[PDB]
Design a binder for this molecule. Sequence first.
Ligand SMILES: Nc1ncnc2c1ncn2[C@@H]1O[C@H](COP(=O)(O)O)[C@@H](O)[C@H]1O
Ligand SMILES: Nc1ncnc2c1ncn2[C@@H]1O[C@H](COP(=O)(O)O)[C@@H](O)[C@H]1O
Ligand SMILES: [Mg+2]
Ligand SMILES: [Mg+2]
Lengths: 336, 336
Amino acid sequence: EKIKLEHGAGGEIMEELLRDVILKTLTLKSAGGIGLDALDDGATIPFGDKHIVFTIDGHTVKPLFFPGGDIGRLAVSGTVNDLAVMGAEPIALANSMIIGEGLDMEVLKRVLKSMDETAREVPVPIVTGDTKVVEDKIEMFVITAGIGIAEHPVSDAGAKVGDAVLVSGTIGDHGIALMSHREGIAFETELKSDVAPIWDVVKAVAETIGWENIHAMKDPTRAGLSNALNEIARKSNVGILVREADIPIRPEVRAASEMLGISPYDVANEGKVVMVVAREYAEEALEAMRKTEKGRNAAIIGEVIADYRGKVLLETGIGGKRFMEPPEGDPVPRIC
Amino acid sequence: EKIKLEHGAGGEIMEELLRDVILKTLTLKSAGGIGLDALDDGATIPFGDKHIVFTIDGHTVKPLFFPGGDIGRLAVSGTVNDLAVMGAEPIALANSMIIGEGLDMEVLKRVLKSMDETAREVPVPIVTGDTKVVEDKIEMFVITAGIGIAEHPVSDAGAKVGDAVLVSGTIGDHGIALMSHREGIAFETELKSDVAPIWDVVKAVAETIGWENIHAMKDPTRAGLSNALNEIARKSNVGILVREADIPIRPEVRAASEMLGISPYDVANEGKVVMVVAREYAEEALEAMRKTEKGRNAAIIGEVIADYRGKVLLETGIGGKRFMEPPEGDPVPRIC
Ligand SMILES: Nc1ncnc2c1ncn2[C@@H]1O[C@H](COP(=O)(O)O)[C@@H](O)[C@H]1O
Ligand SMILES: Nc1ncnc2c1ncn2[C@@H]1O[C@H](COP(=O)(O)O)[C@@H](O)[C@H]1O
Ligand SMILES: [Mg+2]
Ligand SMILES: [Mg+2]
């Protein structure tokens, strides 16, 4: 048996590798809180009356620079966002770079400048790192780890019947922008990735409704909104019912996805959060998001239900329903 | 200007890249304690009456499996050792893997099993991670980040005049074993790498003499003992005088290094610590190390002096001296 691209594509095939190989081989997997077996956006460690949150993400996107961002902005944003969806204020990043021999020094400078600018938006410092140079023709991979502090960690398994399901903005932007750029599809301007740190959106909600009323979150990166909703449903052992008409999609992203023959629900987002909140605070949560710049297009898209446990239903027309199936993997190669 | 292999070789050429490009481009570099500008083995963050210590290391060693270890054992050991030389008890690791499409699943299983076994020696859990699969023919890169807790962080800049300089064991084992394996040099058995987690050696000393009497430590990985001593001298603004005869070198490593035409002082070690301790506790520190299995061959090799600030002197014969020059880089390609 050989490793396939699908094993790193963030969908069901990767999930099989994680459960059958990684989780079964590693034995020490928790430091006292959320650990590897939870397969959440990060891990947690009790520390005093708070929790340290710990995450890591590798980035192998091609091309390194794309409309709306680059591998540097992606590296900072992805790690900040993984901490944010665990309920953690980011406190430090670590930056590993693996660089192909012969890369232009100016490329490395541009990547670092983008990391710096993106980190300053949070704000969060890059406090340690590592650099390796290899003969392989890879251009550059960037791997960032993050530490945050959470007073009240939020899992992807805490959804309750009756809760509202929100997204902080338009869906499909990153994956579709990257595929569109590769295919030469563009409108009045090129479609831009949404890549950005969204700790401010999560914090805004928590400051309004309290951490206890945010029941679950996921960062809908690899394999998209569909993967994220399916994971929350499965891990929380609940059903999720979403109204297709209420899911925000940028008009240009809708058009490009049709041309590409790919669903915007199935591709990576890099500046969005999926959030599940107590029914009675759903409108307060939505208003808090829409007050921020990065959450300006937020919407309530669904609700958690008692039946169809572990499944996600899409409602269309005047009430008809079908399953929103978990992707086998992200249909976009080298997307992040 | 292009990125060269030397830029990742852990010596003076890498130091130039760090100071002229990375440190000058990144602006947010500290979370309140030791930060990026210190260029130490890790960073520190005040937390209550203790300090969180944070480190990251990428591993691109070839071949993946070598005498005495593999990339999995290297990934766990290197990160644990970086935390240990900051004075930190390891509490959690994060595991990023980037895998070449087509790698045998059995190779991935073997690597993970080695990580598991090595982590269990510490003991320290692997609590989060990431997997990417790329088309590039890289086999596998492993990037690990670590979190530890230190009551009293130890810098590489705290050496004082009169202090003793110790190493926890034989010097040059890893780099020379890897080069010997590539060249087909072997004795009754193949030379083994020393790769191993050495938190127990550091802890043993601290439990004996107290953290306050350990003034500096470095993990002598890339560019070897020579690089580590030069960095401590330069950052502490002191001279270091070492007696060549007192530096422990395995007889087989000495022989192989001669055949290879490479100094054992200039190549990576993966199971060793360089430690600088208060003069009056040097013998207690040495005894504490030699009581452990991994520190069994520890030696006092030198002392910190007031002149030749920023330099390292090697004493030979009956008193003659020359400089131990900082390497331009590790003379071993793809060593870690
Ligand atoms: N190579 C790996 N080692 C350990 N844990 C992993 C690895 N790859 C993924 N994970 C975990 O699997 C889940 C999904 O990974 P990600 O694709 O980073 O969201 C997260 O909980 C990760 O911590
Ligand atoms: N790409 C990078 N980004 C940020 N810091 C780095 C990078 N590479 C190395 N460093 C820092 O430079 C020092 C030496 O790196 P290392 O070779 O990992 O010992 C350490 O303090 C690292 O944290
Ligand atoms: Mg995530
Ligand atoms: Mg180090």
